[PDB]
């Protein structure tokens with residue numbers, strides 16, 4: 001079965017081996033589907049990222065094709081640029097843009113963002129989601145770990161390994177996918193769902209940005225899911241630490257009934273996002289500057 005899948009991947013990826021033009025691989029990250037290294041382009045001295053995913057180490061091996069469909073069809077300003085894909089031994093390698101500012105996780109766990117900064121992030125993410133949802137693409141793993149930054153504060157969506165497409169022929173998805181603490185209620189309830197689940201997950205990320213952790217983060221994953229499924233929408237630790245504008249925004253995200261939840265398109269017009277600062281406003285939050 002493994003050799004069968006190797007062959008299948010070979011027919012969709014680029015030919016060759018990026019080790020022929022890259023030097024000095026250094027591991028910088030570990031994700032749900034594999035590791036991420038920086039590498040130096042020999043000819044230019046430029047830095048790229050290389051995501052390496054072991055075919056044998058996947059829960060759902062077929063989801064590896066998501067990397068390919070996204071790379072081919074859904075490139076965008078607030079989405080990480082993907083350059084080439086390769087089959088290297090038993091691994092799928094994706095050579096992509098290096099986002100040197102790192103992931104939003106490092107910021108939310110170590111510093112407190114103000115609302116100019118939170119609004120900047122939300123605006124960037126919602127811009128990406130509005131375009132993706134309009135083409136039927138659902139990300140399904142929105143969380144601070146999936147948001148990457150450039151050195152000058154530009155925000156980009158990454159980690160599309162769990163995404164799916166809906167359409168007239170396939171209006172809803174049914175799969176149990178994502179990261180427990182960020183999963184929408186209807187998804188946990190095993191109801192057919194749509195792009196609305198990304199909006200709930202963004203709400204949880206707003207809580208990350210304000211409080212530093214998602215709700216129920218101290219609980220075990222399976223217990224947290226049960227609590228998300230059963231209880232009223234999760235609450236901020238301290239409501240006084242958010243403006244009424246941000247509270248009103250968050251209230252449109254964390255709605256249990258998917259039909260009543262705001263869409264990305266509608267949220268781009270919300271007053272809270274008027275507070276959004278330029279990318280420069282994010283820069284002082286990064287490790288190399290604080």
Ligand SMILES: O=S(=O)(c1cccc2cnccc12)N1CCCNCC1
Pocket residue numbers: 028029030031032036049051080097098099100102103145146148158159
């Ligand atoms: O920052 S990453 O190293 C990362 C991922 C994908 C592309 C990247 C591009 N440049 C820097 C870091 C990147 N990352 C590890 C996996 C899951 N945890 C957080 C994300």
